[PDB]
Amino acid sequence: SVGIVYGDQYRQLCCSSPKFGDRYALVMDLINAYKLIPELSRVPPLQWDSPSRMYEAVTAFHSTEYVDALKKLQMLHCEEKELTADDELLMDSFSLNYDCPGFPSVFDYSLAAVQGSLAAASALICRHCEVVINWGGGWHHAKRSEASGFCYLNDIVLAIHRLVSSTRQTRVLYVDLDLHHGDGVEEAFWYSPRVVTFSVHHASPGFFPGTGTWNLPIFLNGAGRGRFSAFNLPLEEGINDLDWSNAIGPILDSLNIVIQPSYVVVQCGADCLATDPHRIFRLTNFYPSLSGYLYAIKKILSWKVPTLILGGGGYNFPDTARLWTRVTALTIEEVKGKKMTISPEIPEHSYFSRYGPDFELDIDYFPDSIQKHHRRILEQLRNYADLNKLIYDYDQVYQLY
């Protein structure tokens, strides 16, 4: 079974932010327009039996004072009057400003992604679904007591925490395909060997958030019993589908071989697309040159490990829907063994006119340092296996590269 998180109130809240607008409605309505909904099990977002239960769930990672401050920010933005000087200082102390401003539903919006991804984790734990999709989640930059990068609450960290705590041990592999380094998730599990994190991303001087690269400098990779358990691959601008695919393919396969995870969690932020306004990487959604995203998801799904697939960044809304619709169809095919035939032309539906002027499913695009990174990462995986007394065939993993 393949699940997907949605609901009427969930759709309203996911569409209530100034930054991401109606993106989630475009995504779900294109998936619906291509007749994929009957193939999928709807997973309802989690709701709680009291305010105390909600706080207990969110403060599994975030501090109570931060949660209090985020709730107060919503209240204040639901009244006409501006903040007092003391209220400005309070919000500033949690970085609730600049990139992460207040707006009238900021807390309900943020909490909704948590509700969706916690329900997705439970559906995997109870074996109701083999894979669950939540295009409303993936907010990987939020920290314990700090908003960052328009991420206010880290739904990813909370989902992973539910997975590892459900248990000769439970291990989670987190794979972050976003253009940006997944710093919040990496930091949350910096001391935990049972959650291995792996982010591929652009990094360069001054580019957000600044981490996930050399810090002569060296790569940090975890601490305490979590030493060697945070993996990173920073890539230069301009990379295309094939080179990005060859860059991460052998790493993914070797992480699966050595770690043998009980669950996989993928963040699939779409800001790597060639047509995203960042204009950094040159990936596509093409499906025969094969989309880097579809190559990676197909490989991860070939492992037959229960898998959570989340959204994230993506600032060209119709092209993000074009990508995530193909990811959704691919998941159905690999998991159910049931061919999905997607028309090359956008079907008529409520947002049809947003896909102009062409109305094609394909996005509108004309398509040595990596080897040193591979050597470094393979040594780190060996060190991780040594330290955690894991059994693995060094010859077979070396061949992968």
Ligand SMILES: Cc1ccc(C(=O)NO)cc1NCc1ccccc1
């Ligand atoms: C600052 C910033 C931080 C994080 C992200 C992001 O996608 N993180 O995954 C994205 C941005 N900015 C993207 C952007 C910039 C200008 C206009 C619209 C989007």
Ligand SMILES: [K+]
């Ligand atoms: K990433």
Ligand SMILES: [K+]
């Ligand atoms: K870790």
Ligand SMILES: [Zn+2]
């Ligand atoms: Zn991003």
